[PDB]
Amino acid sequence: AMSLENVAFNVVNKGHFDGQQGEVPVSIINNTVYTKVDGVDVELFENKTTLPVNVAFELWAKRNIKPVPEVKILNNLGVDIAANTVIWDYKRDAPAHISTIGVCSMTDIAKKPTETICAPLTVFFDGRVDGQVDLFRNARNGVLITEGSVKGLQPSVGPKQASLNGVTLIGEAVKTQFNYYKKVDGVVQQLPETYFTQSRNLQEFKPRSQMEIDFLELAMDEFIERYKLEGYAFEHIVYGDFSHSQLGGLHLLIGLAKRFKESPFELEDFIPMDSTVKNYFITDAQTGSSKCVCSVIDLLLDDFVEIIKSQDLSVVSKVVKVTIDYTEISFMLWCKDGHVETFYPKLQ
Amino acid sequence: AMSLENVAFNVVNKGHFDGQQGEVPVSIINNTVYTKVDGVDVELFENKTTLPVNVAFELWAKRNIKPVPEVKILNNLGVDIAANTVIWDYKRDAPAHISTIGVCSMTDIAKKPTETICAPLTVFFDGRVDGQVDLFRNARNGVLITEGSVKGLQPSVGPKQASLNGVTLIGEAVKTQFNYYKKVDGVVQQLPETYFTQSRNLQEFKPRSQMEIDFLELAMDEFIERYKLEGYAFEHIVYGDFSHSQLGGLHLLIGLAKRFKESPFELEDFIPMDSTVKNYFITDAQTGSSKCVCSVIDLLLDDFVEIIKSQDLSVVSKVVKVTIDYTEISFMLWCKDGHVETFYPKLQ
Amino acid sequence: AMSLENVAFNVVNKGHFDGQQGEVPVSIINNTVYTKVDGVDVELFENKTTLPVNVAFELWAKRNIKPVPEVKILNNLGVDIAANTVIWDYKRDAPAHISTIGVCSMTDIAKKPTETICAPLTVFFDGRVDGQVDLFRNARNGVLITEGSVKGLQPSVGPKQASLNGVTLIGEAVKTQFNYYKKVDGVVQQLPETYFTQSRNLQEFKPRSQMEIDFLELAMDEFIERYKLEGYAFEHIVYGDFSHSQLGGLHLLIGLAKRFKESPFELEDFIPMDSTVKNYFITDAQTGSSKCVCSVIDLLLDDFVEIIKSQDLSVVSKVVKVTIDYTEISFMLWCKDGHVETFYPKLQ
Amino acid sequence: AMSLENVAFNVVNKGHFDGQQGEVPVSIINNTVYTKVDGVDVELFENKTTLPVNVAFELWAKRNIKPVPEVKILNNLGVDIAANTVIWDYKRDAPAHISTIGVCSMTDIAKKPTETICAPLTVFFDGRVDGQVDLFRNARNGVLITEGSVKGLQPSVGPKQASLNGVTLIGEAVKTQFNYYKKVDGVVQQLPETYFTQSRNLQEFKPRSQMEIDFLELAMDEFIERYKLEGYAFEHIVYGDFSHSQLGGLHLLIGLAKRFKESPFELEDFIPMDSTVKNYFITDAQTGSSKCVCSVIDLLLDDFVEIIKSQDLSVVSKVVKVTIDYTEISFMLWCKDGHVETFYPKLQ
Amino acid sequence: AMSLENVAFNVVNKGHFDGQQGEVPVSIINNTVYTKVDGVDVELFENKTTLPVNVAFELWAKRNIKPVPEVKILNNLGVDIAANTVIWDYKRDAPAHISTIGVCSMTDIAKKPTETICAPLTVFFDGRVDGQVDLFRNARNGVLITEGSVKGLQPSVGPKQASLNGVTLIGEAVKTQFNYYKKVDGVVQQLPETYFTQSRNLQEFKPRSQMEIDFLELAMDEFIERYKLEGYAFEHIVYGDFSHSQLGGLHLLIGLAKRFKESPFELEDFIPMDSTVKNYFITDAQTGSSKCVCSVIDLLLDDFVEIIKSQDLSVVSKVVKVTIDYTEISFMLWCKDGHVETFYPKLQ
Ligand SMILES: Cc1cc([C@@H]2CCCN2S(C)(=O)=O)no1
Ligand SMILES: Cc1cc([C@@H]2CCCN2S(C)(=O)=O)no1
Ligand SMILES: Cc1cc([C@@H]2CCCN2S(C)(=O)=O)no1
Ligand SMILES: Cc1cc([C@H]2CCCN2S(C)(=O)=O)no1
Ligand SMILES: Cc1cc([C@H]2CCCN2S(C)(=O)=O)no1
């Protein structure tokens, strides 16, 4: 009994699609959905997707409002479609997946993930929804998230944080750390050992360890001294070199956050999407130091120190592959006379 | 239980809105409504109105598919809104009236024509729908059409032709000639004695009398001779003067139709709408004679001959008011030495 | 002598429509109005309304730039149209009323509010404009605002605050508190006893009483102690319960403001419009506690304490009707053993 | 080396995409692709599809310009995608299939039809392109057209006509009759014995047999007499009954073509697409007889006579399934006292 | 005193911009200009240009309504801009020139053609407008048309036909044949001796000589016999070869018109604009013979016979340059044993 007016009634009365009965008058003008409220049109949704306005409106109304894995994790694990839900990508203002399974008549490829069309796709299953752990067991390809243990399956502990309505957070009143399971061609995969990105903001950055507290509170030379980081190019890589026309280093989000409290800078997100490594065209407002492609990763400073201190510093240029968010991130390690010169998440 | 998907289901399965239950997947992209048919989008409607695409789609689906009065008649009688139907204007590809009464939640000003909001508006009532002759009696303002007599109400016999799905025709299998009634401020108004325009096409023009048959067959000088029209400027007014840079006369549709079989011409409909008098920017392709505003009326040649022969030809310039389609059409009559020079439906 | 180029000249030279003579070159591309300034197009207005771009531009230029009643008050008092002005709704980026009286040729239903078309509509009259108090006296329906007394009419003192160019403020250099008068079918209404919402921001919240200062400065248990609020569920209703997956209470804007200084949260305004009670899909960023429809009202904490302390706490569930902004706001009062459990502005 | 400017260069210089090198300046404004020709923009394509303008432009440029099966045949045979070509649907002004294989980077699901993503889809293969008969053999699902025999494969002789650049024709300088083959889940399927629709126009209708020549020349009673069709309701079914408000019969295109030479009528194609059975909202302009859903099929009158004369006329109502264009078309046969009352392609 | 509402008033009341005073209510929605006529919006203009809707509307209203040179002639003579007029391109539904001189505030580069910005541009001057022959004399670059002689200036007699409101015609009531003059860098240029294209339609083709009358009446072998055209490949070039998959010849519009009366064909105008040589993707509906780029020229058959009979037939391949519409048109002449094989307006 699905309609535009019923999807709109649910948005107006329930804050999202809740399966409630009823209709409100709707008007569509270009890429915006309006509703008549006491004789005047009130905007309900502006389509920022490449889908038809009414189709994107329904998928946004039918989005998952429970803490879900962040889109970068789902992408890294090869998720193609979700089972009976919509993972809304808040960084793109669009659905995270092209098609749906049992959500919207326009985007649905199947009603149940058991349909043979879903067999070659990695379907995302949520153990919190009844019977989805059993659907993962029967699926050929898929990713499963659970809050507890699964019989016969060994889990991969995911990041502490999940996305709740576009807000990335480590839950206190809700569980956000999931057990991850994956299957390729009927075979349960052994998920690799992985670091996780911390998913922090530049403006609301909070340290998550004593090393991170010391990075933000101490001066450059005393932090490098305290943590025995001499010869590891933290001055360039983490702190950033703003002395030349091309901005040097600044590849760790904690370093950008430290810089941000002293002086502002413009970060141009030229590929706006969720990813383990982010690329920004950065312009430092104080110095005028800039970089077209400044790759930034948000690792816990302890995790970054462990990665850089676990490298052989005897090569001039070397690709260093690190598992972050279940994906292989290539870094470029440049050394000279046994000391680091630069270390950055490899661009292009 | 009104929805976009149900309006679309009715269009696809019934050819129009028929109150049938069911939904089809719909996608809206810009001003077009599409439906998924075997995996591909098929266009159902292109919005050419100034209303939101989905609202115009519903009003077009809910259009009256019975022979209805032509929009020019309804306009001439001062109709503002229709009671529980949509009069679709096929000349404008838009609803004939801004608001509705019991049709669409977005355009409705009321559910019943008895609501006090409808009292100041001239509501159109159809005696063919049950209870609408009584709704006219209750209405402060309105126009009523009927197929027979309404006890006590003095009728006006309307035009022989009506519009059935955009096709103007004099019915054979259907009744297209109605009795017309009107009320202004609770008082039944006496509709004037009127001529009716014939509503013919230039390309499919058919004569509707022996005078009209003779006009199209006989040469100019022998038709004027046979019908004693010497001194009535038919050579200028009806036939048209193509000898100078400004096209002379050509104000009767029959004259344009006669011209059309010999040589083509461009008629630019710069105000595209239904009206008793039409204005065209005409360019004769053979001679290059043209006129920016050439007013054209489609009167039966007998009715035009009766109007011109009933005039006093002793004045230089005089306004001649003639009742055509219930409205007062002003003509400009120019005479010299007791003979007509020109007679044309007056501009501005 | 109204034109798009003259409306644009006034915007460019006067900051708004001021009746000045002159024209500037204008270009319209989609929903944006541009002007040529030294060979380059400069954006003057982006249409966010459901009206044609040029019509919305003219109504926005012709908006009232004096402190006017907030749209929620006008809506609550049943205002349909304004007399010879445009009340711009800054929360919707659109005109507050569909039609105008003596403002714009496209939206005008009349030139003067004395026209019989305006008689059934509640016309808003401004006593500050010459002769508008007399127009209210002669109008069948209407709402009048004055700065002083009206002969023969008893006033209803409105809120201290008004909207000046979208900025809600209690005037110091301008008068913002008006005397309100209303007429229904020629009869001056006795406006009801009413509380007013304070119209404050979450980010710029300022206390307006010693109880409000104490709420923000004291801890939960000592404020509840000082003001004898034990058993009134302020911990749930005003302070908010962030311990479970569903956010508990948080229905008073002062409580959201207190929370906001400690930790941020996402308030999704899913029906963006001016209203006495606002609905938000709230997600607490610290805990992950969330609520799809969290109704929020901005009452002075003293006014809310007076409302809750004036209730009978012997019923399990009861609707409590309170007059706020001249409208009847239904609250849901839930009690147990003579104590409040919850009290919230009733949703749907 | 694919680009918008190269696709545009090919359209301008080759009449379509021909793999030629070069670029022309392009501008995209809304849904139209323009090119600069001597300082002025010349329209190259107007997007009437639900795809992005530049993507639809590339697929239209890359359309198959050889005689191809008509879209109704491809749909009836279950074709989902074409192998390394674009079948352009000229009835919809859009690609016949959503995705492509080796055509456009935006719509491509694969580069070669051998990719496992294509395995569940019925891929269309053209034996006229090198290596495509072998790609059919490797394909799990597919439809193959050939000009000659494929060793081992049992052929289906298809329709005489094919679509060459939107023009449906029976080839003289080109081969338009193909051998058809189909595979479902690796197994070559035996295509049924079928009738073919003739794909004729109402305005350019030409008879294709002596019975069809006699239908258009002879009067109703003498054609029915000559071909022994008494009691087969041809008067209703083929000729059409225009005496009542609902148009009776008129389900054969030849009957509509015969009617068309005497008097015009409106055929509203409310689902504009290629199909074996077409549905029209028909309004006869002469009588005013109309039908919301008038199903029309273009069978050779001999083929229709053979179908109706092969039926048992002893049942009141019966569904008659006939294979037309490889699909099963259900007809509704209504009889009384051993004679036909009506026979029509069944609706819904 | 220029405005959108005044331009709209002129269109409604004068059929075009006539400098009349007054305003009508206008609404702009997307690319369409509407006007309120008795409470409903009536479309006045649909923007098919790459200019802003209101700017294109003003230029279309301000178009030249006198017979003007066809856009192909103006392009061939290098015209960049017109002096104080708009040449409307009816083949493109857009202004023929990007900028204006004294027409529209948005498109104007100058008010008078004497401004130094116009000096490098070839300005079009009309001797029928007062003072424009003197403005040509002052102009550094320009093209001038006149009806009579200009003392001292050596004339070029132009084509007999001109475009009057989009209708190409040889005038009878108006003068359409002009004297042409041109200036490049202050120097009056001698216009070459030229042939003129006839500017005829395929559907309304009329012969303009006894050779053209004989081409359309006589069979191929007797026309070729009568006019001694043996060995000149008229069978291929003019008549067309429809026997192979690639359509042979068919480069003269008279040959396409002769073919058109026997059987229809699709002519795809892939570069829709006015030009001396037109390119079409042609598909013969009878045979299925087609050609992606079929260059077509409309020369008087006598003029084409004179061109082909004035060539040396002793070379295998040779470029033949012919002056048509003041421009140099290259033809490709292919011979064998002293006879023509093909002759076509050269592509790219
Ligand atoms: C029912 C019905 C009535 C008609 C009549 C008789 C024939 C002409 N018309 S009319 C007066 O134009 O509407 N046709 O069907
Ligand atoms: C090559 C080629 C083959 C054809 C044949 C022969 C003539 C009719 N056709 S057909 C069977 O309809 O496609 N034409 O060119
Ligand atoms: C004034 C005027 C002049 C013309 C002339 C005479 C008739 C043909 N033409 S022309 C040479 O083609 O333009 N018509 O009106
Ligand atoms: C159940 C449940 C768990 C949680 C939170 C609280 C702290 C730990 N986690 S977790 C692992 O990060 O998601 N809240 O409810
Ligand atoms: C006159 C006038 C009044 C005001 C302000 C100042 C303080 C009180 N008010 S009010 C009642 O809130 O609007 N300013 O000018």
Short mmCIF file of N, CA and C in Angstrom, two decimals, chain A residues 100-144:
data_model
loop_
_atom_site.label_atom_id
_atom_site.label_comp_id
_atom_site.label_asym_id
_atom_site.label_seq_id
_atom_site.Cartn_x
_atom_site.Cartn_y
_atom_site.Cartn_z
N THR A 100 17.79 -1.86 -3.76
CA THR A 100 17.31 -2.28 -2.45
C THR A 100 16.74 -3.72 -2.52
N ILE A 101 16.49 -4.32 -1.34
CA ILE A 101 15.85 -5.64 -1.25
C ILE A 101 14.72 -5.44 -0.28
N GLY A 102 13.49 -5.47 -0.76
CA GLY A 102 12.29 -5.30 0.06
C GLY A 102 12.07 -3.93 0.68
N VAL A 103 12.46 -2.86 -0.01
CA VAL A 103 12.32 -1.50 0.50
C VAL A 103 11.40 -0.59 -0.36
N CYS A 104 11.73 -0.41 -1.64
CA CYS A 104 11.06 0.52 -2.52
C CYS A 104 10.80 -0.16 -3.85
N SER A 105 9.59 -0.08 -4.39
CA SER A 105 9.25 -0.72 -5.67
C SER A 105 10.12 -0.30 -6.84
N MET A 106 10.57 0.96 -6.85
CA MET A 106 11.42 1.48 -7.92
C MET A 106 12.86 0.95 -7.88
N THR A 107 13.46 0.84 -6.68
CA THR A 107 14.85 0.41 -6.56
C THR A 107 15.05 -1.07 -6.23
N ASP A 108 13.98 -1.79 -5.87
CA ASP A 108 14.06 -3.21 -5.49
C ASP A 108 14.47 -4.12 -6.60
N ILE A 109 15.49 -4.95 -6.35
CA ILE A 109 15.87 -6.02 -7.29
C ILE A 109 15.21 -7.36 -6.89
N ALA A 110 14.73 -7.46 -5.63
CA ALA A 110 14.10 -8.60 -5.00
C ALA A 110 13.28 -8.11 -3.79
N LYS A 111 12.38 -8.96 -3.25
CA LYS A 111 11.63 -8.68 -2.03
C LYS A 111 12.37 -9.30 -0.80
N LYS A 112 13.01 -10.47 -1.01
CA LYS A 112 13.75 -11.20 0.02
C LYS A 112 15.19 -11.44 -0.45
N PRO A 113 16.19 -11.36 0.44
CA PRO A 113 17.59 -11.57 0.00
C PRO A 113 17.92 -13.00 -0.48
N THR A 114 16.96 -13.94 -0.31
CA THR A 114 17.02 -15.34 -0.72
C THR A 114 16.77 -15.53 -2.22
N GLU A 115 16.34 -14.46 -2.95
CA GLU A 115 16.09 -14.52 -4.38
C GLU A 115 17.41 -14.70 -5.11
N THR A 116 17.43 -15.52 -6.17
CA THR A 116 18.66 -15.86 -6.86
C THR A 116 19.39 -14.65 -7.46
N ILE A 117 18.71 -13.50 -7.62
CA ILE A 117 19.37 -12.29 -8.12
C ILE A 117 20.40 -11.74 -7.10
N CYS A 118 20.15 -11.96 -5.80
CA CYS A 118 20.99 -11.49 -4.70
C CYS A 118 22.18 -12.37 -4.44
N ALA A 119 22.12 -13.66 -4.84
CA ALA A 119 23.20 -14.64 -4.65
C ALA A 119 24.59 -14.11 -5.04
N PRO A 120 24.81 -13.50 -6.24
CA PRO A 120 26.15 -12.98 -6.55
C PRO A 120 26.55 -11.66 -5.85
N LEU A 121 25.60 -10.99 -5.16
CA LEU A 121 25.88 -9.72 -4.49
C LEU A 121 26.20 -9.91 -3.03
N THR A 122 27.10 -9.09 -2.48
CA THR A 122 27.40 -9.15 -1.06
C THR A 122 26.31 -8.35 -0.33
N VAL A 123 25.35 -9.07 0.24
CA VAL A 123 24.22 -8.48 0.93
C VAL A 123 24.60 -8.20 2.37
N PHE A 124 24.23 -7.03 2.89
CA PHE A 124 24.50 -6.68 4.27
C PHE A 124 23.32 -7.16 5.11
N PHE A 125 23.61 -7.95 6.14
CA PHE A 125 22.68 -8.53 7.09
C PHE A 125 22.95 -7.95 8.47
N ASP A 126 21.88 -7.65 9.19
CA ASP A 126 21.89 -7.07 10.53
C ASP A 126 21.34 -8.12 11.52
N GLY A 127 22.22 -8.65 12.36
CA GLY A 127 21.87 -9.64 13.37
C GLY A 127 20.84 -9.15 14.36
N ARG A 128 20.65 -7.82 14.47
CA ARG A 128 19.67 -7.21 15.35
C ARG A 128 18.22 -7.36 14.83
N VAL A 129 18.05 -7.58 13.53
CA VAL A 129 16.75 -7.81 12.93
C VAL A 129 16.52 -9.32 13.00
N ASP A 130 15.33 -9.76 13.42
CA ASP A 130 15.01 -11.17 13.53
C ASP A 130 15.25 -11.94 12.23
N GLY A 131 15.88 -13.10 12.35
CA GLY A 131 16.15 -14.01 11.25
C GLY A 131 17.22 -13.61 10.26
N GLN A 132 17.92 -12.47 10.48
CA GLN A 132 18.95 -12.05 9.54
C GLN A 132 20.25 -12.81 9.70
N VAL A 133 20.55 -13.32 10.91
CA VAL A 133 21.74 -14.15 11.10
C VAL A 133 21.56 -15.48 10.32
N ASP A 134 20.33 -16.00 10.26
CA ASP A 134 20.03 -17.21 9.50
C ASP A 134 20.05 -16.96 7.99
N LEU A 135 19.67 -15.76 7.56
CA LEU A 135 19.72 -15.35 6.15
C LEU A 135 21.18 -15.23 5.67
N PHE A 136 22.09 -14.80 6.56
CA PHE A 136 23.52 -14.72 6.27
C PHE A 136 24.09 -16.13 6.08
N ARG A 137 23.65 -17.07 6.95
CA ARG A 137 24.04 -18.48 6.91
C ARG A 137 23.66 -19.11 5.59
N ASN A 138 22.52 -18.71 5.02
CA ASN A 138 22.06 -19.28 3.76
C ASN A 138 22.53 -18.51 2.53
N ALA A 139 22.94 -17.24 2.68
CA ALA A 139 23.40 -16.41 1.57
C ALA A 139 24.74 -16.83 0.99
N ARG A 140 24.92 -16.65 -0.32
CA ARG A 140 26.17 -17.02 -0.97
C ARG A 140 27.23 -15.97 -0.64
N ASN A 141 26.87 -14.69 -0.77
CA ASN A 141 27.76 -13.57 -0.44
C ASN A 141 27.08 -12.64 0.53
N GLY A 142 27.84 -12.13 1.48
CA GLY A 142 27.29 -11.21 2.46
C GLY A 142 28.20 -10.79 3.58
N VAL A 143 27.79 -9.73 4.28
CA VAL A 143 28.47 -9.20 5.46
C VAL A 143 27.41 -9.18 6.57
N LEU A 144 27.75 -9.72 7.75
CA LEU A 144 26.83 -9.77 8.86
C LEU A 144 27.36 -8.96 10.04
#
